Structures are given as C-alpha cells and as structure tokens.
Curated annotation (Swiss-Prot):
This is Beta-lactamase. It is an enzyme of class 3 (hydrolase). Belongs to the class-C beta-lactamase family. It is found in: Periplasm. One of its GO terms (cellular component) is outer membrane-bounded periplasmic space. It comes from Escherichia coli (strain K12). Changing V295E: Increases activity about 100-fold with respect to cefotaxime. Reduces activity about 5-fold with respect to cephalothin. Reduces thermodynamic stability.
Length: 358
C-alpha cells in the first residue's frame, strides 16, 4: 500500500487497539476505489489463531445495510412499493393501529415507536404475530424516528414475500452471489466455521445467539475482503451489471427523512460531505443513536447524493463493526473487531483516516 495509507493506519488503529483492548481487528481502506487490507491480533485467543483476510466477523447491525439494499432490489423489480401498507403483506395484522403504517415506515424506523428489540420470548410465527398485534404506538406514523430491530426486521421479512423465497435465500441469490460475496453468511456453514472468529465480552468468548428476525437486523457474518467489496459496490453502483441491484443500492442511499444533519436511507444513514466530524462521532453514541427524534419527510426522496458521508455502526455481544464511505471521493473504510467497544471511538478513528486521505 502507499506509504501515506500505511502511516495513518498504524498511527490511528494501533493506538485504538491499545486504548480499547481489542483482541483482533481487520481494517480495509478503500483509496481511489482500491482496498488495502490490515490485520492485528487474534481471532481465537486461546488457540492463538491470528486474524487473517479470511476471518469471519459478526457484523451486527451493519447487517441492516444488506437488508436495505435487498429491499431496494425488490422495489426495482416492482415486487414492492414503499407506500404499500404493511397489511398488504401480512393480512393477519388486523389490529387498527397498523392502519396507515407502510413499508417505508418499517424500513426507516418511523412507524411510531416499534421497540428496539423483538422480545426474546418470541420463538414462532404465532408468537411474532401476537407481538405486533399487541404493540401500541407511542406516536403517529411518519413523525418520529426510533431505531429498532423490530421495525426494519419486519421490513426485510415482508419485502421478500412476493419473491416466494426465504429471506436468506433471497439475500444469497439476489445480493451475495451477484456481488461475489462468497464468504458472507447469515448461517455459517460447518466447512467455514474454522474461520469464524470468537467475540470477547468481559474476557469470555461469545457468539451471537439466535433471535427472531436476527438475519434481517443483526445476523450477518463476513470477512474483511467481502466487506471491502460491499463498500466498493456501494461506492460505484454503476459497476454492478444486474440492473435491479444497481438500482437497489442507489435506492438504499436515497434520503427519506432528515433529523439534524442526518438523513435516513434504507439501512444506510447519510450526511452531506464535508461532514462535521464531531456530529458523526457524538451522534454514534447509543445514548443518541437509540433516542427518539422527530423527522421531516423528504418528498420525493433525494436520489443518492455523491457528496455524502454514508455509514453504519454495528455490534453484537462480542463484536464491534463500522463501515463508512464517500462516493464522490471513492474513499471508504471497514473496521471489524471481535470486541464491542464504544461507537464514538470507531467513528473518530475512521474520520481521522479518511480525512487524512481526502
Ligand atoms: C445492531 O448492531 C444491533 C445489535 N443488537 C445487539 C444489542 O442489542 O446490543 C444484540 C444483537 C442484542 N440481541 C438481542 C437479541 N439477540 C439474540 N441479541 S447483542 O447484545 O447480543
Ligand atoms: Cl507511531
Ligand atoms: Zn506507533
Ligand atoms: Zn470472499
Ligand atoms: Zn472459501
């Protein structure tokens, strides 16, 4: 890699690892469209297995970017419309509060207060229906954004219904395979489990536990190479030969709602570039990122703006991830770690690197 990249990566990430006690980390810096890879530490401490470019990490909520693009691909196929009512795809959702809640609201967390989590007691389709049937909204739809796995999670599940495919089969055939993400998995196959890093929480080795709608909201695992290719695909959608997927990527970066200097896409979140770094750093703290905030509709949604900081944080019990990119500059970064360390530390490091390379 260019010396300038090597230097800023060492001086930014090695101290981050020292400061945050991260056991293993993989970073990809995309510079002029090309990924440069860096690894540190161990995927499995006790076995002394190093992190490599083939190590699988839990992406956590970075998974929502795949769900948003899959939903965009379904829009481009004409299979769904964001204005469609939820009940078109789930008629059994007869409760009156669902009158007026659209797929747009589900995808963008604006349904009116769907909770952050699907309750752990939900273990079957019948349990899931009772959960949504009994939910009482705190706000009218389309007025407040409250980040929630139960919101975009339902969006993903319903968006694939017209295809007749399971969510996992839809994601594999319509996103992973066309983009040659051949080491990205909702369910890690046994033959690949040897590359699956352990996450570390308070010293103990942990993996994410199953949960309702986990694949849609936080359940994808991937390598640093595949995630760099994901960033390249979102930086340069016109390079993708499948037209519905090219357009789905663009639709996921459209701006549907604004709150402060942040715009809500499908999975992705966006800000105008140049960005105020303190805003993205401070705003990534869960105290803010998970709080309810009023939104203003953008009608029609702004088509994907090239001069944007586009990003998503993600976490599981034992992992912490971050992806950010700037289409106008063909600049991006992926940071995968097997410790869940505070989001602001992730964003600060990413901005220090990309700012140095602009
Ligand atoms: C996106 O990053 C969301 C991640 N969810 C985390 C979290 O809430 O901190 C997990 C995945 C929570 N969770 C709920 C149900 N299950 C199986 N995990 S993590 O702490 O376990
Ligand atoms: Cl140094
Ligand atoms: Zn040094
Ligand atoms: Zn791969
Ligand atoms: Zn392989």
């Amino acid at each position: 890699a260019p010396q300038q990249i090597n230097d800023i990566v060492h001086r930014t990430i090695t101290p981050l690892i020292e400061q945050q006690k991260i056991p293993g980390m993989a970073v990809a810096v995309i510079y002029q469209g090309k990924p440069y890879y860096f690894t540190w530490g161990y995927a499995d401490i006790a076995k002394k297995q190093p992190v490599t470019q083939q190590t699988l990490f839990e992406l956590g909520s970075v998974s929502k970017t795949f769900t948003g693009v899959l939903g965009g691909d379904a829009i481009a196929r004409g299979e769904i419309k964001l204005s469609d009512p939820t009940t078109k795809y789930w008629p059994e959702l007869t409760a009156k509060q669902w009158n007026g809640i659209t797929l747009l609201h589900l995808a963008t967390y604006t349904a009116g207060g769907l909770p952050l989590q699907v309750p752990d007691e939900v273990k079957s389709s019948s349990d899931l229906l009772r959960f949504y049937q009994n939910w009482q909204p705190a706000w009218a739809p389309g007025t407040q954004r409250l980040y929630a796995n139960s919101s975009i999670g339902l969006f993903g599940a319903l968006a694939v219904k017209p295809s007749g495919l399971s969510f996992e089969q839809a994601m594999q055939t319509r996103v992973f395979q066309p983009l040659k993400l051949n080491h990205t998995w909702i369910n890690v196959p046994p033959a690949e489990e040897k590359n699956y890093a352990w996450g570390y929480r308070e010293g103990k080795a942990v993996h994410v536990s199953p949960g309702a709608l986990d694949a849609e909201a936080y359940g994808v695992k991937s390598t640093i190479e595949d995630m760099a290719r994901w960033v390249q695909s979102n930086l340069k959608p016109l390079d993708i030969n499948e037209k519905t997927l090219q357009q789905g990527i663009q639709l996921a970066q459209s701006r549907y709602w604004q709150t402060g200097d942040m715009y809500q896409g499908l999975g992705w979140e966006m800000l105008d570039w140049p960005v105020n770094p303190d805003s993205i750093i401070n705003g990534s703290d869960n105290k803010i990122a998970l709080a309810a905030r009023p939104v203003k509709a953008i009608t029609p949604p702004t088509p994907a703006v090239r001069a944007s900081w586009v990003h998503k944080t993600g976490a599981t019990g034992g992992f912490g991830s971050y992806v950010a990119f700037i289409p106008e500059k063909e600049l991006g970064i992926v940071m995968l770690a097997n410790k869940n360390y505070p989001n602001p530390a992730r964003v600060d490091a990413a901005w220090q690197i990309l700012n140095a390379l602009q």
